[PDB]
């Protein structure tokens, strides 16, 4: 199951200074970037165009240009008309895309100063529980605009799913790649035993500290950390007693090994 994600990052320091940057993710892989500086969206992958034609894409490319500039002037209008409820600096984040089933569900979420305030749903924008009361009139206005409502609707209902199914076909060679993890052991006075695992793709990996048949229930699994080359890094730990570290092992299971589990003895 894959989640397509267009993330938009917009900053407003004052009147005059503003910048909108954006990145597009299919699952855990980047497909697009769009800096404030660039006129066109850039492809990060060779397949980021999916199965859209050149015209298909160029028309879509324009619509976002017309959006990015409009999104800025509008937000800065919304602050000029506001006050003193709102003032600079202002941060806006926007997350939109669609999840994939064997069937889909699209989404649009807006967050203002870090807190999630607005989502688009069905045929209309709506404020989300706890969001600032002053957003109501603004959202009402935004919904009396049919053209915008309609473009957002068409992008969410029609394009996102179509666009995504193309990428899933196009990037098959990159999404189904298999990368083997190399692993090493270290220790550090808390004594603590760290099991490093690096370079694996895709993301699901099984790492555990062992004493024979027995998985040590005391294993602390870290957070997945990104490598520079689109592989993953992970660590596992286990606090040990004085003599207890002699006889322990680190076992690593991954899809890239295929039965060939990595077992490191301390």
């Amino acid at each position, epitope marked *: 199951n894959y989640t397509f994600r267009c993330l938009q990052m917009s900053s407003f320091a004052n009147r005059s200074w503003s910048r909108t940057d954006s990145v597009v993710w299919l699952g855990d892989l980047q497909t697009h970037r769009w800096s404030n500086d660039s006129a066109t969206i850039s492809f990060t992958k060779p397949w980021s165009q999916g199965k859209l034609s050149n015209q*298909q894409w160029e*028309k879509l490319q324009h619509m976002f240009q*017309v959006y990015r500039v409009s999104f800025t002037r509008d937000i800065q209008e919304l602050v000029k008309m506001m006050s003193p409820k709102e003032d600079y600096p202002i941060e806006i984040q926007l997350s939109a895309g669609c999840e994939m089933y064997p069937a889909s569900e699209s989404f649009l979420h807006v967050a203002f100063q870090g807190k999630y305030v607005v989502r688009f749903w069905g045929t209309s924008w709506q404020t989300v529980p706890g969001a600032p009361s002053w957003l109501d009139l603004p959202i009402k206005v935004l919904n009396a605009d049919q053209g*915008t409502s*309609a473009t957002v*609707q*068409m992008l969410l209902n029609d394009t996102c799913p179509l666009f995504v199914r193309g990428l899933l076909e196009a990037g098959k060679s990159d999404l189904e790649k298999q990368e083997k993890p190399v692993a090493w052991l270290s220790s550090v006075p808390s004594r603590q035993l760290v099991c490093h695992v690096s370079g694996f793709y895709p993301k699901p990996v099984w790492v555990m500290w062992m004493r024979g048949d027995q998985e040590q229930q005391g294993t602390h699994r870290g957070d997945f950390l990104p490598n520079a080359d689109e592989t993953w890094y992970l660590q596992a730990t286990l606090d040990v007693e004085a003599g207890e570290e002699a006889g322990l092992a680190c076992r690593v299971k991954h899809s890239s090994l295929g039965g060939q589990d990595i077992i490191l003895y301390w």
Partner: T-cell receptor
Amino acid sequence: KVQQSPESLSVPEGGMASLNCTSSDRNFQYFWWYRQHSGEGPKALMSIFSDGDKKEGRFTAHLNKASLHVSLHIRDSQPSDSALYFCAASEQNNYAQGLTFGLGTRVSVFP
Amino acid sequence: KVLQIPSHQIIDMGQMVTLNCDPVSNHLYFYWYKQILGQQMEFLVNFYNGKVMEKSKLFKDQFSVERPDGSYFTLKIQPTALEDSAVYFCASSFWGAYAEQFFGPGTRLTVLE
């Protein structure tokens, strides 16, 4: 091609003019109604693209994407309603488009 | 309001005609529409930012649509069949699709022998 009905309708002041429109391509289930008076620029009356009804004041419109069939209902017909009503289908997934109208319907409201 | 001027123009065959259009500010999607004897509305061209996009079959080989910065949006018939005598409408959109197109009052062209 988008086929309209009829060639011409004739409604009495107060009655309701009802028109039809059908798309033949499954990728054109997003419709517009544009009204134009004599020697004058067309104005957009209303959009649909959604399976329901849509009441825009004195105007109601029903769409069924299922059979690509639309209807426009001009209830409480004004004298100032007598005009050429056009209907066009827009393409699914385009984002840069010409409104491509059918043959249009001349409505004559009379007192 | 999308403005067209003028409005009622009579031209003799063989000499080029300029049809000026002054679209609504903030819009960047332009259109030309032809209606002869007042019957059928016909799409010709759509323009965006700096270049044309969809040119229809009705867009003759003798036609040209420019939009320099500061000036109007101009269709130029050059030149100039007796079949051109019709009404042409300019239009603005803001959104590329799925949103209202605004039509001008049109220019009545009359090419004559």
